[PDB]
Amino acid sequence: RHKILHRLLQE
Amino acid sequence: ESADLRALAKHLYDSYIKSFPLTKAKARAILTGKTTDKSPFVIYDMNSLMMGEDKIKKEVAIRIFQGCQFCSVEAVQEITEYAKSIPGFVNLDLNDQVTLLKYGVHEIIYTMLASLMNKDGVLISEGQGFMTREFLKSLRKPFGDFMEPKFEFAVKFNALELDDSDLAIFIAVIILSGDRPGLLNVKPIEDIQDNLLQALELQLKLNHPESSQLFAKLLQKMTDLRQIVTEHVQLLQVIKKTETDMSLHPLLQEIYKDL
């Protein structure tokens, strides 16, 4: 759904 | 107490200095010549633009619009790094974190963009370019009406003479907005924003003791921000339809869709 945002967040 | 709220203003201010490379401090230095360091390459027209490519990083309006995309994306990354330092933000439901950011980052982009603006133009590429407001209006519709609302906000907003340490809390108040469409769990968001608003009010009384109801003035601008944002999303809706050689960046596409 928001895979770049999820990824920037959980990075 | 007041002590815990100054500590919060300090933690936020430090994260902001760390997360955002070009602060309002540097930006005002540059825009006043008072940096006494190398002035920015001024972009006032088509020729100055193409001579400018050295200090910057197929159609001109399409090239400008799509170069702002790389800037927006690095902004979203800086703002996302910043939100993670807002105490209690990362402990929220990950789906809430995404929602707050999704609706927040554009309101913070326009807030901080104002730091880089005066009546005549805006600093670009971390203060080493300066693109004129007139040249930006000069672009061909629907690209000539893209940055003019942001210049309009920035001139009213810069009036309040806020500094980096005020903006650090103000930014954090905008992200922790409990009224974002789709939030699974408003209350713990509203718990943090309550604290942030209390920290902001303290900060504004201390840093601007002469200035009075600056706190009240600054909460009404959080409304001006949402309309410059919805107006902005519509203008993208239009050019996504009328201009289909243009690529919207994946990250920008995640944000603006379902918005």
From Swiss-Prot, chain A:
Disulfide bonds: none
Post-translational modification: Sumoylated; sumoylation increases its interaction with PGR and prolongs its retention in the nucleus. It does not prevent its ubiquitination and does not exert a clear effect on the stability of the protein. Ubiquitinated; leading to proteasome-mediated degradation. Ubiquitination and sumoylation take place at different sites.
Tissues of expression: Widely expressed.
Compartments in which it is found: Nucleus
UniProt signal peptide: none
Intervals of motif LXXLL motif 4: 5-9
Illness the protein is tied to: A chromosomal aberration involving NCOA1 is a cause of rhabdomyosarcoma. Translocation t(2;2)(q35;p23) with PAX3 generates the NCOA1-PAX3 oncogene consisting of the N-terminus part of PAX3 and the C-terminus part of NCOA1. The fusion protein acts as a transcriptional activator. Rhabdomyosarcoma is the most common soft tissue carcinoma in childhood, representing 5-8% of all malignancies in children.
Family: Belongs to the SRC/p160 nuclear receptor coactivator family.
Subunit structure: Interacts with PPARA; the interaction is direct. Interacts with PPARG; the interaction is direct. Interacts with ESRRG; the interaction is direct. Interacts with STAT5A (via FDL motif). Interacts with STAT5B (via FDL motif). Interacts with STAT6 (via LXXLL motif). Interacts (via LXXLL 1, 2 and 3 motifs) with RORC (via AF-2 motif). Interacts with ASXL1. Interacts with the methyltransferase CARM1. Interacts with COPS5. Interacts with the histone acetyltransferase CREBBP. Interacts with DDX5. Interacts with the histone acetyltransferase EP300. Interacts with ESR1. Interacts with GCCR.
The record's note on its domains: The C-terminal (1107-1441) part mediates the histone acetyltransferase (HAT) activity.
Function: Nuclear receptor coactivator that directly binds nuclear receptors and stimulates the transcriptional activities in a hormone-dependent fashion. Involved in the coactivation of different nuclear receptors, such as for steroids (PGR, GR and ER), retinoids (RXRs), thyroid hormone (TRs) and prostanoids (PPARs). Also involved in coactivation mediated by STAT3, STAT5A, STAT5B and STAT6 transcription factors. Displays histone acetyltransferase activity toward H3 and H4; the relevance of such activity remains however unclear.
Protein name: Nuclear receptor coactivator 1
Species this protein is from: Homo sapiens
Full-protein interval shown: 686 to 696 of 1441
Curated annotation (Swiss-Prot), chain B:
Chief localisation class: nucleus
Alphabetical UniProt keywords: Activator, Biological rhythms, Cytoplasm, Diabetes mellitus, Disease variant, DNA-binding, Glycoprotein, Isopeptide bond, Metal-binding, Nucleus, Obesity, Phosphoprotein, Receptor, Transcription, Transcription regulation, Ubl conjugation, Zinc, Zinc-finger
Motif (9aaTAD): 250-258
Interaction with FAM120B as annotated region, ranges: 1-46
Keyword Glycoprotein appears in the UniProt entry: yes
One Gene Ontology term from the biological process aspect of the record: fatty acid metabolic process
Cross-linked sites for Glycyl lysine isopeptide (Lys-Gly) (interchain with G-Cter in ubiquitin): K18
GO molecular function ontology, one term from the record: double-stranded DNA binding
Glycoprotein among keywords: yes
Disulfide partners: none
PTM summary: Phosphorylated in basal conditions and dephosphorylated when treated with the ligand. May be dephosphorylated by PPP5C. Ubiquitinated by E3 ubiquitin-protein ligase complex containing FBXO9; leading to proteasomal degradation. Ubiquitinated at Lys-18 by TRIM55 leading to proteasomal degradation. Ubiquitinated by E3 ubiquitin-protein ligase STUB1/CHIP; leading to proteasomal degradation.
Tissue specificity of this protein: Highest expression in adipose tissue. Lower in skeletal muscle, spleen, heart and liver. Also detectable in placenta, lung and ovary.
Effect of K18R: More than 50% loss of ubiquitination
Induction and repression of expression: (Microbial infection) Expression increases when incubated with M.tuberculosis or its lipoprotein LpqH; induction is TLR2-dependent (at protein level).
Regulation: PDPK1 activates its transcriptional activity independently of its kinase activity.
Gene Ontology CC, one term: receptor complex
All copies of domain NR LBD, residue ranges: 4-258
UniProt-annotated location(s): Nucleus; Cytoplasm
Annotated binding of rosiglitazone, by residue: Q69, F70, C71, S72, H106, H232, Y256
Protein family (similarity comment): Belongs to the nuclear hormone receptor family. NR1 subfamily.
Function: Nuclear receptor that binds peroxisome proliferators such as hypolipidemic drugs and fatty acids. Once activated by a ligand, the nuclear receptor binds to DNA specific PPAR response elements (PPRE) and modulates the transcription of its target genes, such as acyl-CoA oxidase. It therefore controls the peroxisomal beta-oxidation pathway of fatty acids. Key regulator of adipocyte differentiation and glucose homeostasis. ARF6 acts as a key regulator of the tissue-specific adipocyte P2 (aP2) enhancer. (Microbial infection) Upon treatment with M.tuberculosis or its lipoprotein LpqH, phosphorylation of MAPK p38 and IL-6 production are modulated, probably via this protein.
Swiss-Prot/TrEMBL domain comment: The 9aaTAD motif is a transactivation domain present in a large number of yeast and animal transcription factors.
Name assigned to this protein: Peroxisome proliferator-activated receptor gamma
Gene name per UniProt: PPARG
Residue range from the parent sequence: 235 to 504 of 505
